[PDB]
Amino acid sequence: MRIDELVPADPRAVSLYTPYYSQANRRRYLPYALSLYQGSSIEGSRAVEGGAPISFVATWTVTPLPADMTRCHLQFNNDAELTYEILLPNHEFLEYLIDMLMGYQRMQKTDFPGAFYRRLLGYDS
């Protein structure tokens, strides 16, 4: 399962697919992202238990080398005046994504951690 079986690998594609994130041997996150990379993209409403489902959009594509970041757009309570644009390097973005899924789905509460909100706000303390 590699990008050379899909579209011709650009240097951008090569660098985004280069990091193999794994906690043991194989990891379902890499091939799931390769499937999205084809142009399916991610857009939907993720259900946060204890509150309400908020729309989120994430797109993976060949972004320039110094800009090798994944961009996610999250609206708070589907309010367009409250839009968060959170983008991070492709090796750093998955760490954010696990914390996001873990905090809202696993704990079943709509309260974000203060240290997690520091990174979302973009406050360099």
Side-chain angles (χ1 to χ4, degrees), residues 53-77:
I54 80 185
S55 299
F56 75 102
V57 182
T59 304
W60 289 72
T61 191
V62 277
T63 175
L65 189 65
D68 279 346
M69 301 185 187
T70 295
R71 303 194 182 191
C72 195
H73 291 276
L74 281 134
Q75 289 172 331
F76 193 79
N77 205 39

PDB file of all heavy atoms in Angstrom, residues 53-77:
ATOM      1  N   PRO A  53     -23.272  17.455  17.729  1.00  0.00           N
ATOM      2  CA  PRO A  53     -22.313  17.185  16.657  1.00  0.00           C
ATOM      3  C   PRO A  53     -21.897  18.437  15.912  1.00  0.00           C
ATOM      4  O   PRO A  53     -22.737  19.158  15.366  1.00  0.00           O
ATOM      5  CB  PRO A  53     -23.058  16.204  15.739  1.00  0.00           C
ATOM      6  CG  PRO A  53     -24.523  16.570  15.922  1.00  0.00           C
ATOM      7  CD  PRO A  53     -24.642  17.023  17.379  1.00  0.00           C
ATOM      8  N   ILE A  54     -20.568  18.708  15.854  1.00  0.00           N
ATOM      9  CA  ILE A  54     -20.073  19.914  15.188  1.00  0.00           C
ATOM     10  C   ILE A  54     -19.391  19.517  13.894  1.00  0.00           C
ATOM     11  O   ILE A  54     -18.693  18.495  13.800  1.00  0.00           O
ATOM     12  CB  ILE A  54     -19.126  20.730  16.069  1.00  0.00           C
ATOM     13  CG1 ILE A  54     -17.678  20.162  16.099  1.00  0.00           C
ATOM     14  CG2 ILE A  54     -19.733  20.788  17.492  1.00  0.00           C
ATOM     15  CD1 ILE A  54     -16.780  20.908  17.086  1.00  0.00           C
ATOM     16  N   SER A  55     -19.686  20.290  12.810  1.00  0.00           N
ATOM     17  CA  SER A  55     -19.088  20.036  11.500  1.00  0.00           C
ATOM     18  C   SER A  55     -17.589  20.253  11.502  1.00  0.00           C
ATOM     19  O   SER A  55     -17.061  21.203  12.097  1.00  0.00           O
ATOM     20  CB  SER A  55     -19.678  20.931  10.386  1.00  0.00           C
ATOM     21  OG  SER A  55     -21.082  20.689  10.260  1.00  0.00           O
ATOM     22  N   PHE A  56     -16.886  19.366  10.765  1.00  0.00           N
ATOM     23  CA  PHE A  56     -15.449  19.439  10.649  1.00  0.00           C
ATOM     24  C   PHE A  56     -15.103  19.092   9.217  1.00  0.00           C
ATOM     25  O   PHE A  56     -15.781  18.281   8.574  1.00  0.00           O
ATOM     26  CB  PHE A  56     -14.717  18.478  11.639  1.00  0.00           C
ATOM     27  CG  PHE A  56     -14.731  17.005  11.303  1.00  0.00           C
ATOM     28  CD1 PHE A  56     -13.618  16.403  10.750  1.00  0.00           C
ATOM     29  CD2 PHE A  56     -15.852  16.238  11.542  1.00  0.00           C
ATOM     30  CE1 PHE A  56     -13.626  15.063  10.448  1.00  0.00           C
ATOM     31  CE2 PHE A  56     -15.859  14.896  11.236  1.00  0.00           C
ATOM     32  CZ  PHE A  56     -14.746  14.309  10.691  1.00  0.00           C
ATOM     33  N   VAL A  57     -14.056  19.758   8.676  1.00  0.00           N
ATOM     34  CA  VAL A  57     -13.611  19.509   7.304  1.00  0.00           C
ATOM     35  C   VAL A  57     -12.116  19.292   7.350  1.00  0.00           C
ATOM     36  O   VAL A  57     -11.421  20.073   7.998  1.00  0.00           O
ATOM     37  CB  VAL A  57     -13.852  20.710   6.397  1.00  0.00           C
ATOM     38  CG1 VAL A  57     -13.410  20.362   4.957  1.00  0.00           C
ATOM     39  CG2 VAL A  57     -15.343  21.101   6.461  1.00  0.00           C
ATOM     40  N   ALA A  58     -11.568  18.243   6.717  1.00  0.00           N
ATOM     41  CA  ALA A  58     -10.124  18.055   6.696  1.00  0.00           C
ATOM     42  C   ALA A  58      -9.781  17.610   5.285  1.00  0.00           C
ATOM     43  O   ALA A  58     -10.464  16.768   4.697  1.00  0.00           O
ATOM     44  CB  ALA A  58      -9.634  17.001   7.710  1.00  0.00           C
ATOM     45  N   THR A  59      -8.729  18.202   4.680  1.00  0.00           N
ATOM     46  CA  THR A  59      -8.360  17.840   3.309  1.00  0.00           C
ATOM     47  C   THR A  59      -6.882  17.566   3.254  1.00  0.00           C
ATOM     48  O   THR A  59      -6.055  18.330   3.748  1.00  0.00           O
ATOM     49  CB  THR A  59      -8.693  18.924   2.292  1.00  0.00           C
ATOM     50  OG1 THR A  59     -10.076  19.249   2.368  1.00  0.00           O
ATOM     51  CG2 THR A  59      -8.385  18.431   0.862  1.00  0.00           C
ATOM     52  N   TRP A  60      -6.553  16.419   2.613  1.00  0.00           N
ATOM     53  CA  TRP A  60      -5.190  15.977   2.423  1.00  0.00           C
ATOM     54  C   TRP A  60      -4.957  16.035   0.926  1.00  0.00           C
ATOM     55  O   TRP A  60      -5.775  15.545   0.152  1.00  0.00           O
ATOM     56  CB  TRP A  60      -4.981  14.511   2.884  1.00  0.00           C
ATOM     57  CG  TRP A  60      -5.025  14.297   4.387  1.00  0.00           C
ATOM     58  CD1 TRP A  60      -6.110  14.332   5.220  1.00  0.00           C
ATOM     59  CD2 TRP A  60      -3.893  13.956   5.227  1.00  0.00           C
ATOM     60  NE1 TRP A  60      -5.730  14.060   6.508  1.00  0.00           N
ATOM     61  CE2 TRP A  60      -4.377  13.825   6.528  1.00  0.00           C
ATOM     62  CE3 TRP A  60      -2.560  13.769   4.965  1.00  0.00           C
ATOM     63  CZ2 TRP A  60      -3.554  13.510   7.568  1.00  0.00           C
ATOM     64  CZ3 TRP A  60      -1.724  13.450   6.016  1.00  0.00           C
ATOM     65  CH2 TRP A  60      -2.214  13.320   7.302  1.00  0.00           C
ATOM     66  N   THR A  61      -3.831  16.632   0.484  1.00  0.00           N
ATOM     67  CA  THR A  61      -3.546  16.748  -0.932  1.00  0.00           C
ATOM     68  C   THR A  61      -2.085  17.084  -0.991  1.00  0.00           C
ATOM     69  O   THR A  61      -1.437  17.171   0.060  1.00  0.00           O
ATOM     70  CB  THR A  61      -4.381  17.818  -1.646  1.00  0.00           C
ATOM     71  OG1 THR A  61      -4.243  17.715  -3.064  1.00  0.00           O
ATOM     72  CG2 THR A  61      -3.975  19.235  -1.185  1.00  0.00           C
ATOM     73  N   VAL A  62      -1.497  17.245  -2.195  1.00  0.00           N
ATOM     74  CA  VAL A  62      -0.109  17.586  -2.291  1.00  0.00           C
ATOM     75  C   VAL A  62       0.068  19.082  -2.003  1.00  0.00           C
ATOM     76  O   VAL A  62      -0.137  19.952  -2.854  1.00  0.00           O
ATOM     77  CB  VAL A  62       0.444  17.252  -3.671  1.00  0.00           C
ATOM     78  CG1 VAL A  62       0.823  15.762  -3.685  1.00  0.00           C
ATOM     79  CG2 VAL A  62      -0.607  17.567  -4.767  1.00  0.00           C
ATOM     80  N   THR A  63       0.483  19.383  -0.750  1.00  0.00           N
ATOM     81  CA  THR A  63       0.736  20.751  -0.302  1.00  0.00           C
ATOM     82  C   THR A  63       2.249  20.929  -0.360  1.00  0.00           C
ATOM     83  O   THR A  63       2.982  19.968  -0.120  1.00  0.00           O
ATOM     84  CB  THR A  63       0.192  21.012   1.110  1.00  0.00           C
ATOM     85  OG1 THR A  63       0.534  22.313   1.583  1.00  0.00           O
ATOM     86  CG2 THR A  63       0.698  19.943   2.100  1.00  0.00           C
ATOM     87  N   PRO A  64       2.750  22.126  -0.714  1.00  0.00           N
ATOM     88  CA  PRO A  64       4.200  22.381  -0.813  1.00  0.00           C
ATOM     89  C   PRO A  64       5.034  21.951   0.359  1.00  0.00           C
ATOM     90  O   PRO A  64       4.621  21.999   1.494  1.00  0.00           O
ATOM     91  CB  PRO A  64       4.298  23.894  -0.996  1.00  0.00           C
ATOM     92  CG  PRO A  64       3.046  24.204  -1.776  1.00  0.00           C
ATOM     93  CD  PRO A  64       1.981  23.310  -1.138  1.00  0.00           C
ATOM     94  N   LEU A  65       6.283  21.594   0.043  1.00  0.00           N
ATOM     95  CA  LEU A  65       7.276  21.087   0.999  1.00  0.00           C
ATOM     96  C   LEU A  65       7.388  21.903   2.311  1.00  0.00           C
ATOM     97  O   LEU A  65       7.307  21.306   3.393  1.00  0.00           O
ATOM     98  CB  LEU A  65       8.665  20.999   0.332  1.00  0.00           C
ATOM     99  CG  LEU A  65       9.721  20.278   1.180  1.00  0.00           C
ATOM    100  CD1 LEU A  65       9.379  18.792   1.387  1.00  0.00           C
ATOM    101  CD2 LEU A  65      11.126  20.446   0.579  1.00  0.00           C
ATOM    102  N   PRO A  66       7.551  23.246   2.295  1.00  0.00           N
ATOM    103  CA  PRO A  66       7.651  24.013   3.552  1.00  0.00           C
ATOM    104  C   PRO A  66       6.310  24.196   4.224  1.00  0.00           C
ATOM    105  O   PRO A  66       6.207  24.695   5.339  1.00  0.00           O
ATOM    106  CB  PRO A  66       8.259  25.376   3.129  1.00  0.00           C
ATOM    107  CG  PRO A  66       8.605  25.213   1.646  1.00  0.00           C
ATOM    108  CD  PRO A  66       7.631  24.158   1.141  1.00  0.00           C
ATOM    109  N   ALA A  67       5.260  23.758   3.513  1.00  0.00           N
ATOM    110  CA  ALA A  67       3.885  23.870   3.958  1.00  0.00           C
ATOM    111  C   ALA A  67       3.303  22.469   4.124  1.00  0.00           C
ATOM    112  O   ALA A  67       2.096  22.282   3.933  1.00  0.00           O
ATOM    113  CB  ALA A  67       3.020  24.660   2.950  1.00  0.00           C
ATOM    114  N   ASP A  68       4.171  21.434   4.414  1.00  0.00           N
ATOM    115  CA  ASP A  68       3.728  20.034   4.569  1.00  0.00           C
ATOM    116  C   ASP A  68       2.879  19.875   5.838  1.00  0.00           C
ATOM    117  O   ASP A  68       3.260  19.179   6.777  1.00  0.00           O
ATOM    118  CB  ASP A  68       4.935  19.055   4.689  1.00  0.00           C
ATOM    119  CG  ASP A  68       5.555  18.679   3.360  1.00  0.00           C
ATOM    120  OD1 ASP A  68       4.929  18.935   2.308  1.00  0.00           O
ATOM    121  OD2 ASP A  68       6.671  18.099   3.390  1.00  0.00           O
ATOM    122  N   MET A  69       1.707  20.530   5.865  1.00  0.00           N
ATOM    123  CA  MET A  69       0.814  20.482   6.994  1.00  0.00           C
ATOM    124  C   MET A  69      -0.550  20.024   6.524  1.00  0.00           C
ATOM    125  O   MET A  69      -0.942  20.229   5.376  1.00  0.00           O
ATOM    126  CB  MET A  69       0.666  21.882   7.652  1.00  0.00           C
ATOM    127  CG  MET A  69       2.010  22.450   8.143  1.00  0.00           C
ATOM    128  SD  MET A  69       1.846  24.017   9.045  1.00  0.00           S
ATOM    129  CE  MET A  69       3.632  24.309   9.175  1.00  0.00           C
ATOM    130  N   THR A  70      -1.304  19.394   7.450  1.00  0.00           N
ATOM    131  CA  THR A  70      -2.649  18.897   7.162  1.00  0.00           C
ATOM    132  C   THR A  70      -3.579  19.979   7.633  1.00  0.00           C
ATOM    133  O   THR A  70      -3.393  20.422   8.760  1.00  0.00           O
ATOM    134  CB  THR A  70      -2.979  17.669   7.988  1.00  0.00           C
ATOM    135  OG1 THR A  70      -2.128  16.589   7.630  1.00  0.00           O
ATOM    136  CG2 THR A  70      -4.453  17.268   7.787  1.00  0.00           C
ATOM    137  N   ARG A  71      -4.610  20.430   6.872  1.00  0.00           N
ATOM    138  CA  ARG A  71      -5.464  21.509   7.398  1.00  0.00           C
ATOM    139  C   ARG A  71      -6.830  20.965   7.728  1.00  0.00           C
ATOM    140  O   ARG A  71      -7.460  20.254   6.935  1.00  0.00           O
ATOM    141  CB  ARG A  71      -5.676  22.681   6.417  1.00  0.00           C
ATOM    142  CG  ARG A  71      -4.376  23.320   5.948  1.00  0.00           C
ATOM    143  CD  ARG A  71      -4.619  24.669   5.267  1.00  0.00           C
ATOM    144  NE  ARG A  71      -3.308  25.209   4.781  1.00  0.00           N
ATOM    145  CZ  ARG A  71      -3.202  26.498   4.334  1.00  0.00           C
ATOM    146  NH1 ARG A  71      -4.272  27.342   4.404  1.00  0.00           N
ATOM    147  NH2 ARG A  71      -2.014  26.939   3.838  1.00  0.00           N
ATOM    148  N   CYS A  72      -7.299  21.314   8.944  1.00  0.00           N
ATOM    149  CA  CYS A  72      -8.613  20.920   9.413  1.00  0.00           C
ATOM    150  C   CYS A  72      -9.351  22.174   9.816  1.00  0.00           C
ATOM    151  O   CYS A  72      -8.805  23.072  10.463  1.00  0.00           O
ATOM    152  CB  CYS A  72      -8.555  20.000  10.652  1.00  0.00           C
ATOM    153  SG  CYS A  72     -10.144  19.156  10.980  1.00  0.00           S
ATOM    154  N   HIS A  73     -10.629  22.241   9.443  1.00  0.00           N
ATOM    155  CA  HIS A  73     -11.480  23.352   9.778  1.00  0.00           C
ATOM    156  C   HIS A  73     -12.552  22.798  10.685  1.00  0.00           C
ATOM    157  O   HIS A  73     -13.232  21.841  10.325  1.00  0.00           O
ATOM    158  CB  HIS A  73     -12.163  23.940   8.526  1.00  0.00           C
ATOM    159  CG  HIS A  73     -11.216  24.642   7.591  1.00  0.00           C
ATOM    160  ND1 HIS A  73     -10.866  25.963   7.818  1.00  0.00           N
ATOM    161  CD2 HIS A  73     -10.599  24.173   6.468  1.00  0.00           C
ATOM    162  CE1 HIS A  73     -10.045  26.265   6.828  1.00  0.00           C
ATOM    163  NE2 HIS A  73      -9.851  25.222   5.986  1.00  0.00           N
ATOM    164  N   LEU A  74     -12.720  23.395  11.888  1.00  0.00           N
ATOM    165  CA  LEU A  74     -13.711  22.917  12.844  1.00  0.00           C
ATOM    166  C   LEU A  74     -14.561  24.100  13.241  1.00  0.00           C
ATOM    167  O   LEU A  74     -14.043  25.153  13.606  1.00  0.00           O
ATOM    168  CB  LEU A  74     -13.035  22.329  14.114  1.00  0.00           C
ATOM    169  CG  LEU A  74     -12.496  20.896  13.905  1.00  0.00           C
ATOM    170  CD1 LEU A  74     -11.075  20.736  14.476  1.00  0.00           C
ATOM    171  CD2 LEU A  74     -13.445  19.858  14.520  1.00  0.00           C
ATOM    172  N   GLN A  75     -15.907  23.959  13.168  1.00  0.00           N
ATOM    173  CA  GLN A  75     -16.799  25.049  13.552  1.00  0.00           C
ATOM    174  C   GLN A  75     -17.345  24.710  14.913  1.00  0.00           C
ATOM    175  O   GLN A  75     -17.733  23.580  15.168  1.00  0.00           O
ATOM    176  CB  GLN A  75     -17.976  25.235  12.570  1.00  0.00           C
ATOM    177  CG  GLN A  75     -17.509  25.809  11.216  1.00  0.00           C
ATOM    178  CD  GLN A  75     -18.671  25.789  10.222  1.00  0.00           C
ATOM    179  OE1 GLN A  75     -19.555  24.953  10.291  1.00  0.00           O
ATOM    180  NE2 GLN A  75     -18.666  26.733   9.266  1.00  0.00           N
ATOM    181  N   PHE A  76     -17.446  25.706  15.817  1.00  0.00           N
ATOM    182  CA  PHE A  76     -17.919  25.424  17.168  1.00  0.00           C
ATOM    183  C   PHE A  76     -19.440  25.476  17.187  1.00  0.00           C
ATOM    184  O   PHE A  76     -20.048  26.525  16.970  1.00  0.00           O
ATOM    185  CB  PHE A  76     -17.358  26.431  18.201  1.00  0.00           C
ATOM    186  CG  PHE A  76     -17.556  26.021  19.635  1.00  0.00           C
ATOM    187  CD1 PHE A  76     -16.720  25.089  20.215  1.00  0.00           C
ATOM    188  CD2 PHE A  76     -18.577  26.563  20.391  1.00  0.00           C
ATOM    189  CE1 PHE A  76     -16.901  24.707  21.524  1.00  0.00           C
ATOM    190  CE2 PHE A  76     -18.755  26.180  21.701  1.00  0.00           C
ATOM    191  CZ  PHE A  76     -17.916  25.252  22.266  1.00  0.00           C
ATOM    192  N   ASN A  77     -20.071  24.277  17.405  1.00  0.00           N
ATOM    193  CA  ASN A  77     -21.533  24.131  17.485  1.00  0.00           C
ATOM    194  C   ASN A  77     -22.174  24.497  16.141  1.00  0.00           C
ATOM    195  O   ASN A  77     -23.326  24.923  16.089  1.00  0.00           O
ATOM    196  CB  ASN A  77     -22.159  24.998  18.621  1.00  0.00           C
ATOM    197  CG  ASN A  77     -23.491  24.446  19.124  1.00  0.00           C
ATOM    198  OD1 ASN A  77     -23.666  23.247  19.252  1.00  0.00           O
ATOM    199  ND2 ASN A  77     -24.454  25.334  19.427  1.00  0.00           N
TER     200      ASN A  77
END
